[PDB]
Design a protein around this ligand. Structure first.
Ligand SMILES: Cc1ncc(Cc2csc(CCOP(=O)(O)OP(=O)(O)O)c2C)c(N)n1
Ligand SMILES: Cc1ncc(Cc2csc(CCOP(=O)(O)OP(=O)(O)O)c2C)c(N)n1
Ligand SMILES: Cc1ncc(Cc2csc(CCOP(=O)(O)OP(=O)(O)O)c2C)c(N)n1
Ligand SMILES: [Mg+2]
Ligand SMILES: [Mg+2]
Ligand SMILES: [Mg+2]
Lengths: 530, 523, 530, 141
């Protein structure tokens, strides 16, 4: 078996679904075996940033390994940022970068590309030894899985075709029987002894597909359940569904206190930081806080190493007597609906109504891909079937690329994208690849003519005023159907159309005025004053 | 006086002509000063890469300092690429990243693509640090990194000093010069190659004087292209390896006393490769050093080395200007035939011969660059070594900003334009009207010429011309050579809006230069 | 200030006392600045192994940084083993290896030397940037101190003289106020709740010179105190002196049980392994065991990170009410004495008697340097003033070299060395450097004509039979006074002489017969049968 | 040394490249015109054939070259120092070489020589031997 093949098969053997990428000198031989073998569908994008962003999503979507293939040099570096956000958000993107042969020895910078990716991945390896390649691949791949984060793989070209033995399974990671038990023991003990124990569900839960067993726990535990942002959605159809989502300040002040004022706050697979919605360590009692994350548990200031979340859970159940309990009790949830189909100018919230109404009228929910900006804060109030945005990273550019990658693996489902003018100027052009990719995602451009999120924080500043890019009129070039709307009528009307029109990506240019924000973005700002 | 203010001033004194950037939370406080103090012009773009390329171009244009202002995280990262290629081609792009408050890793990455960094978290030190970093950027001509905590943009600081002098081993300088000169005189067929550093440190005059006194054959590199063309001893052409003229390539590579003055060594297409020359008999002066076979003199800035040699060579009136080191393709037959690269070159060269003034040209990667190589220009900016796409458009933009009125020409392939091409939407607010000739062959042709069998090099039809409108510019698509000639003419007559010329080119049609390149890889 | 100088001064500023080493092509320029500056005394040895072994001891002796200077290539690699044992035993040896200039670019193996030392040190760095050198040095040096283990420093020759700014202080390491407190709390709580809490004193205690405060703790704690091997000696003149030393099986079965059967076994700065005397994790209740080591505390299966032993102690006192208590109570200790000055053949134990008697007669105790083999197990029963041997490492070769390095910094004191024939054949020749070094250590060769320690475990094997190297007769060549003894008379007599004769190293070749072992080595073997 | 280094078609058959004293340095030759066959490979200017064990390469070339009787044995590629003047002068390396070489010339059979690092090696180089083992590249004592 050829080396490059042995790899792709491996990726496949692990639930891979595609391989996004852009070729270059050194990467052609590998794209060749990628194409000729036909192992993994080869989708190619216009700019490397979208390459990584799509891989990110194709990974988050199916909760499996994403695949970003780039060429040596500018190709890799031009994608660094996409991998960073993927890393930042436990999105296991397997990066592959063709490198010079092992007999061409000289670089161009005073390795380097390696040290940069060494910086944003969990494991890396230069496949320069056909003998060691197999296990090495198994290792690194085994890492992105164990840790759910990006990995780096360099393949010198004169090695893309070296015969190698097939790639086996992931190397078995460390797990101590006793250690674990002791951990659960202390964890459960800590919970039982708490006043207001609050169990939070986050990202690691959706990555290791553990929702299945955590629902069986949320029940046998008996404590209140809340989700973080990355956790939003989880346990929706579970016996003891979350009582809401935590996004901090801009959120339901009711949920807030419950979390920030607990003494049994069990952060399951949760992320920790001061990234907007993330659970800031500054806003909680570090004393009584069990923090399960990255195969480790830390509460009481001490830590339990090599403790896979799966195991922690599995052993927590072994100590919790089964329960037939259930806290559902009617009441769904109230989203902003009712659009004034009049000719009054659009506002972020109006759009929400727009989509929501369509849905309540009977429309199946489309998963949403949102870029960073006022489009994100507006997407929170929309009924979905999975949301997908850079909340804990704020990496503009995501939006469109992400939605694309999504619909590329959706196996039919359609993807909805929301993005502002400022971000569309960055990656909104990746739609030109929608024809070749055979997908028709619906996009809602939030053209407010400025970097509005930045203006709210420094309105005296002019530089945040942008030009009026006639996007709707540009959608024809990339082969789509564009439509700029000024009023709520042209808005509701256009959307309906979009769902009817398939085969071509639908781009609805929403004309919004500066100042006009979203309810959720409103609350967020008001909350930074006091 | 604020800190930001002090940096901006410190920046302007060293040549700064503008500031390209894109804000974010941490950047905001910094940008407020920027915008207000108006020390430097604050030009915003759309995507970080552009900002990086633009800033890079700006610097090169005025052989001065460039300035890219980003925000912490996604912002800074999404711009690493431009800074790298900058580092590669010795362009001092001063990177300014806003960052977290000091009371409230990117740093570890940048250290890998800048010859100097610093985090100004102490106002008492800020003044000197700024003066140290920029210093290097100037001394080594490479990108530097400055990371500012938003809670220090206003902190008062002693004015920024002057650059801190660098080690100049006066004795080695004199000893090298002797070895160097002797090494030359004593060689069968010695040759002088003028490269990148000669431009960056504005040493054209000197090297022009030396070129004559040293009395040896002259040649430029790819980045050395266009230097000493008005000197008594002009280059015999430009060496770019197998690609170009085989008489110059043979001379360069066969020399037994090669003097790479401020050049770059690298197996990287046009860069003077170590596998092509006889390094044993090479005198490579670079990064303030000089090598030559089991010997490297350190601390010898190029500039002083010239002076050294000049002090060791008697004056001369030896002038040897002949005819055309390189025949520029002309005579565009405006018939109905489809279009081809070399035709674009003629179309372009003819206007010039017709009397038009040669513009400076900015090129992205792809055949557009090889094509630009057969065009008459007044400067040529392109990633000839780094070879990274995207540079084209934003670089032409960036150039024209500080080109005080002069118009810039930009050649970009379809593949590349899809990455940065849209930055043209800023032309309007930016007060620019650059001309763009987009090579739409509907494919990543440069690669197809390496794997014509693969089908992924097949791109769809992007009606770029139809999109020019939406960016406040005029964009026309042409298929024949007749249409090509007419449209190019209109562009030049139309100023006020950027002009986009989407020239449709068949897959398989390559520039002459590129043709030669591929054929040389078959051998 | 020159780079190489800036460094040596740094070492000095940190308590350095010398710089052992062997030069080579690439290392000459650095030895030149080492010599010319005269900052640190430059002692040179015959073979690299002794270079590292002496540095090891010069470090352990004064409990400070040792200094091993070698040349690139064979020089470094030929010393790898010495550094390993130093690392293995928390001996902060600062290794310095001159490297090719930054403009000579090509190696000879398919970096490498760097990766090998990366493997046996705690921090490393290639000083190739005069600007960054200072802080870098401070860093690495700061590491060997914080972690008390070997560090690697590579100095390209064209950099030995680059002007640099002086080297500042060590970079401040992480320390969490809360975390710490929480740790002590749980630690003390764990202790108080124990039945037979046993506090052990080990290596880290002597390295960070903490004995001063630990004695103040051993008192305020109130629990039994025992020392490990590396810990042997500590708290001797303390209010609550150790009740004995723990060396496992071969030790006082009385001490053994107390340790292996505790539920409050506080291993202070202790090492953990199955290395002869070390506290094997296989022989203790991991459940109730506080393990303070490498700036971390682990008990109850969880761990407290970035917890410097100093701090742990300092905060433990803050929670223990001062005490005037004391458990001294006469009884010193009984060592094997009384030598039968008859003409009966020598046995390991006889020699012990020999030295001991001399001491009780009034001789000040000499610190001892013992190699691995039956000489070590015999040295345990000798009255000393500090013992120094590879107990937790078993790296033969140590002996002599070590003793030499010692007396090189002893500031006058004399050093005693014990070593078997088999090890003397490895490094016993380093005595030839005793004249130039101006020291006269007394050495006791245990020539049993074989690798006796190995023979006891496989007596049916012949290969353990060695030849009769006439060492005593070889001592003249290296410029010493050699004397082979066959009987206990020639033994007692020779020793007395040796203490009288100064200026020349004294080598007493003790003729012992195969089979004849040491009491302590006896007990050890008998203990491997059952 | 001049011939080797000036060659415009150098064929290092199973050699080692390295700037390491006696090892054939890359800075001394014209690598562009070098054919270095090593570690089961063959290089030559922007080209490296992999998987070509030396042995087979020879055979290859032999299959491409007609037989020959071209013999060119001359005299002493290297004059071995002899004639040890056994006077009372102190001793010197080259003398040891003569002492050694003379016994051989006197008829004694050349032995194989093993040398450590130091001048002893350079000295062994002027001695008549039946094999010479020494660390000429690694240079470790
Ligand atoms: C890669 C990168 N570069 C810059 C920034 C900085 C930023 C954070 S928010 C924002 C404004 C976004 O404008 P948009 O039209 O998309 O939506 P809206 O604000 O409602 O007008 C910027 C520029 C980030 N986060 N990432
Ligand atoms: C950031 C980056 N990613 C990939 C590549 C690799 C590449 C080198 S050449 C080429 C094809 C360019 O197509 P284009 O339309 O621009 O011009 P042409 O080939 O003549 O049709 C690619 C993808 C580079 N150099 N930089
Ligand atoms: C560097 C190294 N190489 C080999 C060995 C293996 C060994 C462990 S014990 C022993 C015998 C030592 O004989 P010695 O004369 O010194 O004393 P004695 O046993 O009483 O006769 C050997 C060879 C070790 N530990 N280290
Ligand atoms: Mg907007
Ligand atoms: Mg193209
Ligand atoms: Mg022995």
């Amino acid at each position: 078996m050829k080396l490059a093949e042995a790899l792709l098969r491996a990726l496949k053997d692990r639930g891979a679904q595609a391989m996004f990428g852009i070729p270059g000198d050194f990467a052609l031989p590998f794209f060749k075996v990628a194409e000729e073998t036909q192992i993994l569908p080869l989708h190619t994008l216009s700019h490397e940033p979208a390459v990584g962003f799509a891989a990110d999503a194709a990974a988050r979507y199916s909760s499996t390994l994403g695949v970003a293939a780039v060429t040596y040099g500018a190709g890799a570096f031009n994608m660094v940022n996409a991998v960073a956000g993927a890393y930042a958000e436990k999105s296991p993107v397997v990066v592959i970068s063709g490198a010079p042969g092992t007999t061409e020895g000289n670089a161009g910078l005073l390795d380097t590309q390696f040290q940069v990716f060494k910086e944003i991945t969990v494991a890396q390896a230069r496949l320069d030894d056909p003998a060691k390649a197999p296990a090495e691949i198994a290792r690194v791949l085994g890492a992105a899985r164990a840790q759910s984060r990006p990995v780096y793989l360099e393949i010198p070209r004169n090695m893309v075709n070296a015969e190698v033995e097939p790639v086996g399974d992931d190397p078995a990671w460390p797990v101590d029987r006793d250690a674990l038990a002791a951990c659960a023991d202390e964890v459960l003990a800590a919970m039982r002894s708490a006043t207001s124990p609050v169990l939070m569900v986050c990202v690691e839960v959706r990555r290791y597909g553990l929702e299945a067993k955590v629902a069986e726990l949320a029940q046998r535990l008996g404590v209140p359940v809340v989700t973080t942002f990355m956790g939003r959605g989880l346990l929706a159809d579970a016996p003891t569904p979350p009582l809401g989502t935590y996004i901090g300040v801009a959120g339901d002040a009711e949920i807030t206190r419950l979390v920030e004022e607990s003494d049994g706050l069990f952060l399951l697979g949760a992320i920790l930081s001061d990234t907007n919605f993330a659970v800031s360590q500054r806003k909680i009692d570090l004393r009584k806080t069990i923090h399960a994350f990255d195969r480790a548990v830390t509460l009481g200031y001490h830590t339990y190493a090599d403790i896979p979340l799966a195991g922690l859970v599995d052993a927590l159940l072994e100590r919790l007597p089964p329960s037939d309990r259930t806290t559902r009790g009617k009441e769904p949830h109230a989203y902003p609906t009712g659009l004034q189909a009049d000719g009054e100018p659009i506002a972020p919230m109006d759009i929400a109504r727009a989509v929501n109404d369509r849905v309540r009228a009977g429309q199946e929910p489309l998963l949403i891909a949102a870029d960073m900006g006022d489009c994100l804060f507006t997407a929170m109030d929309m009924i979905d079937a999975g949301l997908m945005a850079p909340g804990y990273y704020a990496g503009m550019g995501f939006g469109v690329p992400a939605g694309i990658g999504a619909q590329c693996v959706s196996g039919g489902k359609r993807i909805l994208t929301v993005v502002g003018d400022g971000a569309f100027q960055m990656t909104g052009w990746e739609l030109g690849n929608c024809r070749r990719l055979g997908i028709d995602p619906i996009v809602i451009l939030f053209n407010n003519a400025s970097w509005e999120m930045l203006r709210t924080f420094q309105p005296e500043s002019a530089f945040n005023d942008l030009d009026d890019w006639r996007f709707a009129d540009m959608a024809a070039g990339m082969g789509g159907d564009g439509v700029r709307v000024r009023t709520r009528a042209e808005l509701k009307a256009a959307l309906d159309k979009a769902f009817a029109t398939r085969g071509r990506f639908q781009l609805i240019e929403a004309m919004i005025p500066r100042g006009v924000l979203s309810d959720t973005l409103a609350r967020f700002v008001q909350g930074q004053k006091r």
